[PDB]
């Protein structure tokens, strides 16, 4: 009974930034989802396309555990049909998304008196991200018709902005850690199941 690596994805010292969001493929294991609902510690827990209860009796080709960090009042944007700074230039979710969104408050870890600027997000981009698309470009956002040649001034803006996480911030300003599970059903081996593990 290979136990899927959810201890490594959720309980993880360092998380990525949202524009540069982590991904962790999951295959060839038995996925105990019971811990993830029975927890009750997470502030956001909603799945799309499938009821969570009937997931132990389910099998999939691969699970994709995207894991990143955003400020409190941005978790609403991790959902189908959502818009805003994060959902368009950092991490977009498709309309037909089939998976779960899980997030918990991490101000006791990702903040620091003075401000933990370690985490970033994307301010400007040529256009919106396609679903599940990543953008790690540090190209200086040309905000005029005059090119910037790789340094910022007027009409030139380093597109990555920071997060001033302080433990006194408002909740809508405090850091949260989001884990976006994506479920995959290909005409394929389907090598990940939950508790009902009588087939191998």
């Amino acid at each position: 009974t290979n136990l899927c690596p959810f201890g490594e994805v959720f309980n993880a010292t360092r998380f990525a930034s949202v524009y540069a969001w982590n991904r962790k493929r999951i295959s060839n294991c038995v996925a105990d989802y019971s811990v993830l609902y029975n927890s009750a510690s997470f502030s956001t827990f909603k799945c799309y396309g499938v009821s969570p209860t009937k997931l132990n009796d389910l099998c999939f080709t691969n699970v994709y555990a995207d894991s990143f960090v955003i400020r409190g009042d941005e978790v609403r944007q991790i959902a189908p049909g959502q818009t805003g700074k994060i959902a368009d230039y950092n991490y977009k979710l498709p309309d037909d998304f089939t998976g779960c969104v899980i997030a918990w408050n991490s101000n006791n870890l990702d903040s620091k008196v003075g401000g933990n600027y370690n985490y970033l997000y994307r301010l400007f981009r040529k256009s919106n991200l396609k679903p599940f698309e990543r953008d790690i470009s540090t190209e200086i956002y040309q905000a005029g018709s005059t090119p910037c040649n790789g340094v910022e001034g007027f009409n030139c803006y380093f597109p990555l902005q920071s997060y001033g996480f302080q433990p006194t911030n408002g909740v809508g300003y405090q850091p949260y850690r989001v884990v976006v599970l994506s479920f995959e059903l290909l005409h394929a081996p389907a090598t990940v199941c939950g508790p009902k593990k009588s087939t191998n």
Epitope: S43, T44, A79
Partner: antibody
Framework: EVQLVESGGGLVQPGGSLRLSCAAS????????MSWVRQAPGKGLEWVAN????????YYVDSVKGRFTISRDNAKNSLYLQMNSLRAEDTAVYYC????????????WGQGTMVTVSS | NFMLTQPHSVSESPGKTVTISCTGS????????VQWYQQRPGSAPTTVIY?????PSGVPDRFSGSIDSSSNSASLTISGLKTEDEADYYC??????????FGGGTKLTVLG
């Protein structure tokens, strides 16, 4: 076929004790969380307590925290609510419900038992 | 301090469509699942809608849950009303600080 049957309600003057008990049937009791939801007559619904499906974690409302103790015997398919140091506001109908993970979906509702606290 | 607040009473004709709102007070509705419970007088509550828009087996097509991303609010909607639907309707969700919060309830009166 799911059914829940609450017992052990009635009248008790303030500051007294009383023990509720709700009998499960027709489902795997060891596989659900169990909650008590009360409803003062003519008023709305209020959640009271929830207990994990081994009996490890227990949660309550601040109104009853310290005075109400929730428990369960998975073998005997029964949920309990030890209500001690009662008040007048505790007067309500006390339902027992299946919820099922922890996040909602209070699936089934028993018919309830009356609890009157009057001096 | 995350209250759910819904109006006191709504009403409509024998056939009509009617919509009961449920707006969060401090915290995001659609940060967690939103249920809807029907309760006729003296009876125990029953679940008409679970997991945001979803209805249990046995509940007619007329009931339909939804979640407004704008107003921070969910809404129950009953297309093609029936006098049997006259009841009180409570919305309910969960929040990590105030566990298992409930709405005020709303009396849906089918105008006879």
């Amino acid at each position: 076929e799911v059914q829940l049957v609450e017992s052990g309600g009635g009248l008790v003057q303030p500051g007294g004790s009383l023990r509720l008990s709700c009998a499960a049937s027709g489902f795997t009791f060891s596989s659900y969380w169990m909650s008590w939801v009360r409803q003062a007559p003519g008023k709305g619904l209020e959640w009271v307590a929830n207990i994990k499906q081994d009996g490890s974690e227990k949660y309550y409302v601040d109104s009853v925290k310290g005075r109400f103790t929730i428990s369960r015997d998975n073998a005997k398919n029964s949920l309990y609510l030890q209500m001690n140091s009662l008040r007048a506001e505790d007067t309500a109908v006390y339902y027992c419900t299946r919820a099922g993970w922890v996040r909602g979906a209070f699936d089934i509702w028993g018919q309830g038992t009356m609890v009157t606290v009057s001096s | 301090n995350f209250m759910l607040t819904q109006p006191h009473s709504v009403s409509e004709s024998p056939g009509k469509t009617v919509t009961i709102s449920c707006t969060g007070s401090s915290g995001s509705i659609a940060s967690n699942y939103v249920q809807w419970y029907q309760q006729r007088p003296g009876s125990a509550p029953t679940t008409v809608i679970y997991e945001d828009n979803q209805r249990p087996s046995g509940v007619p097509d007329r009931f339909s849950g939804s979640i407004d991303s704008s107003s921070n609010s969910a809404s129950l909607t009953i297309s093609g009303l029936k006098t049997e639907d006259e009841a009180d309707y409570y919305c309910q969700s969960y929040d990590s600080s105030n566990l298992w919060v409930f709405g005020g309830g709303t009396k849906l009166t089918v105008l006879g």
